[PDB]
Design a protein around this ligand. Structure first.
Ligand code: HEM
Ligand code: HEM
Ligand code: H4B
Ligand code: H4B
Ligand code: CCW
Ligand code: CCW
Ligand code: ZN
Lengths: 407, 411
């Protein structure tokens, strides 16, 4: 019931008690671990509301005050009458920060308390959503000095009036299937791109075409909008030693902004809650550029480096991988666009874990996601035992809207 | 029930039914995943079901389930248990058992090889000297002048827990570690405590950076005894780099034969507490972990210094750059000397093929992703993208506590 985690490089041992406050299920059982699986009424709402308000009032050190009991009454009263309730601004902000704090897959949580929350619950139309999102993009980008932000659209009602951003991220590149059988641009976005085209988007059919936004307000049919190009900061990729690197014609965008998740606070469900921070370099250099099902540039880069590609044991893939990732960090830094390397980020996360253990009694963490996709064991997180469990408020996956929506 | 796993790179989806045959616990629950935790005397009562389950599995494997030979063996084992409180495995069952413990080892990426395992039956051994002789033969056979062959040597099983056979070494071949008065460590820091024990037992330490440790062997619950492996049996590889001529001057070498000796082999409820086994190295074990872990030889700085990398900011990726060069050197050296080794690309690609074959022919393949994914270049290996299910099958290899913690010293 009190659980220990050991760091095997430092022998530091931490005791976790926070897991007892865990509510949602992991997918695992006593017989089987599913740790590496990517996706494992009024009666329901009151305990959920109560549990949240209790933690909220405890956090402002007013647990069991007349203000607390009054609010609990108030939220119960509103549920009994309307079947839902509305969060105070203070609760919304707390809930949002805590959903980030509880995100077991996020290595960047040392930042969790510095999150600008944009309350867009007064939004009613897709044009309204576009305005809120441009404002978020501009604020967060901050001319390259990135600031974490979330924009929160109105909460789910009967579930037939959902607000959704159909894009997986606010800013992403189009993917096209070609007569050739190959893919131009980002293969991850082939399906969404087709949905955009079918909805009327004029695709430039290039390698790095910034997708349009497909915004759904109030369960209505979604609409297309182009983000003003001047609000989309992009970084040309060059290498500090290889003058040829630029001829690869690579670029990426500065602002990572996940737009397809669901924010749950106090049992209320926010299906449109785009949030943004900044990149760890490996996300772009290792995953986006080198995944086989992504831009898959390893072959081309190794060729320019004139590495012996005959045998896997020459580690040509590993050498190219490093140089690609040096270029990504070099380019962002040269252009003064915030980016963090995996050494620095994982070091910060260890310090964050220690803070969380000291001040909160633990930190839910998913090792499979926290350890970077390159140079795993030379980062301190590789050697850190982590306990994974689900706390609320949370960010949850939700099904892609096109599978669900009724036209 | 049927459980699905997806490969997110290929979209291949596999279906697991083998998890239904799993009995032992994982450490996880519906409320908590312990997938990254390193470590999360039986009665006659519990022994016969364990034997029956194992013998049913054995007789099914040889297509003799429900045969007279099957039934007579169950009765024979049952009678032996009630009469003697334990039983003895037939040689065939021992071989099947040891191979299956390997097949079931969810943290092992090398399992494509599981069916080729040379099993040395050392159950007639009685003394530490007898153990030394068995182990020398295992080393020489497995080494095979660099053409490494997988092998296991199996000493007598546990009886009352007071007469255990144990190899105190964590591997048959490993380098000494010495803590210096100034707090620095000479040699391998992982082996400091064991080295101290060896010295206290009477080993004369050469006190260098790569001294092969003596064997410390316990037979029949007796106090352990020291022995030096003949150096001519210990194959070692000097580490050099194909392009960097200064790399040799780091003075690095490593041994060719990895031979884990501190695990317990469980077959049909019987416990083999001394069962050293060996295969061959994946390059990253040495080049990433043994050389570059901060708490091991820790060579990253020195290598990057010699490479003249920009070491003032982590964001130059100097550590990553040096890491690749070290790992190229390890593979180049082993290959140049004709000592078996496998790179992490080959080994993981082979593992995915193994895993797919196991799903099709066995109904599953328990695998621990945390351990299977290599410690460098994770996502450019196919295993990173493979969903895996981890569960415990028997026969199995288990951790056991270190014997210096439990041993009753006779004097
Ligand atoms: C400020 C700098 C941040 C850094 C460096 C960072 C880093 C990361 C990384 C590397 C991942 C793994 C992503 C992947 O492999 O696709 C991740 C996941 C995640 N992050 Fe953070 N993040 C940051 C900010 C934020 C913010 C502001 C939020 C929410 C307010 C957040 C919430 C999440 C969530 C929910 C996941 C898991 C998403 C999933 O399961 O796909 N992050 N983060
Ligand atoms: C033939 C070539 C083999 C290769 C390339 C190989 C590869 C590996 C690697 C890389 C690991 C993780 C090691 C670590 O990080 O410390 C491992 C673990 C393991 N292997 Fe294999 N292995 C091989 C043969 C064998 C054999 C012959 C056995 C037993 C018969 C075996 C049983 C195990 C077990 C039980 C583990 C988990 C050890 C632990 O939890 O500490 N392997 N193997
Ligand atoms: C199958 C496996 O769970 C999957 O590839 C995971 C592994 N670790 C990951 N880690 C991060 N940060 N992001 C990912 O997309 C993944 N993918
Ligand atoms: C805490 C964590 O479980 C621990 O460092 C593990 C991670 N994965 C590993 N994987 C392998 N192959 N070997 C190891 O020693 C480890 N160590
Ligand atoms: C998008 S975010 O909120 O800042 C969190 C983060 N840094 N990464 C999340 C997903 C981004 C994705 N891995 C990508 O490479 O585009
Ligand atoms: C030792 S073995 O049975 O061949 C399995 C294997 N390849 N590795 C297991 C342990 C070796 C250890 N990682 C080492 O670096 O010495
Ligand atoms: Zn688990």
């Amino acid at each position: 019931r009190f659980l220990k985690v050991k760091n095997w490089e430092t022998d530091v041992v931490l005791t976790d008690t926070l897991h007892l406050k865990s509510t949602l299920e992991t997918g695992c059982t006593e017989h089987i671990c599913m740790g590496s699986i990517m996706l494992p009424t009024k009666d329901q709402l009151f305990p959920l509301a109560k549990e949240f308000l209790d933690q909220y009032y405890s956090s402002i050190k007013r647990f069991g005050s007349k203000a607390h009991m009054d609010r609990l009454e108030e939220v119960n009263k509103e549920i009994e009458s309307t079947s839902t309730y509305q969060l105070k601004d203070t609760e919304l902000i707390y809930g949002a920060k805590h959903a980030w704090r509880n995100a077991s897959r996020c290595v960047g949580r040392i930042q969790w308390s510095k999150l600008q929350v944009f309350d867009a619950r007064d939004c009613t139309t897709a044009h309204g959503m576009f305005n809120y999102i441009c404002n978020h993009v501009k604020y967060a980008t901050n001319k390259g000095n990135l600031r974490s932000a979330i924009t929160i659209f109105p909460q789910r009602t009967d579930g037939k009036h959902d607000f959704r951003v159909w894009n997986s991220q606010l800013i992403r590149y189009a993917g096209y299937k070609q007569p050739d059988g190959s893919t131009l641009g980002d293969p991850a976005n082939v399906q969404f791109t087709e949905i955009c085209i079918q909805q009327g988007w004029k695709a430039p059919r290039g390698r790095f075409d910034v997708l349009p936004l497909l915004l759904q307000a109030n369960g209505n049919d979604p609409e297309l909008f182009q983000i003003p190009p001047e609000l989309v900061l992009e970084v040309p990729i060059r290498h500090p030693k290889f003058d040829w690197f630029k001829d690869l014609g690579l670029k990426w965008y500065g602002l990572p902004a996940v737009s397809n998740m669901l924010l749950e606070i106090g049992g209320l469900e926010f299906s449109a809650c785009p949030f943004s921070g900044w990149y760890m370099g490996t996300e772009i250099g290792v995953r986006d550029y080198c995944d086989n099902s992504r831009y898959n540039i390893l072959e081309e880069v190794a060729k320019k480096m004139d590495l012996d590609m005959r045998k896997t044991s020459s580690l040509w893939k590993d050498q190219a991988l490093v140089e690609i990732n040096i270029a990504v960090l070099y380019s962002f830094q040269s252009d003064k666009v915030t980016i963090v390397d995996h050494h620095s980020a994982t070091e910060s996360f260890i310090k964050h874990m220690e803070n969380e253990y000291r001040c909160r009694g633990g930190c839910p963490a998913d090792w499979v996601w926290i350890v970077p996709p390159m140079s795993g064991s030379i980062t301190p997180v590789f050697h850190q035992e982590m306990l994974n469990y689900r706390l609320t408020p949370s960010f949850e996956y939700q099904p892609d809207p096109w599978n669900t929506h009724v036209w």
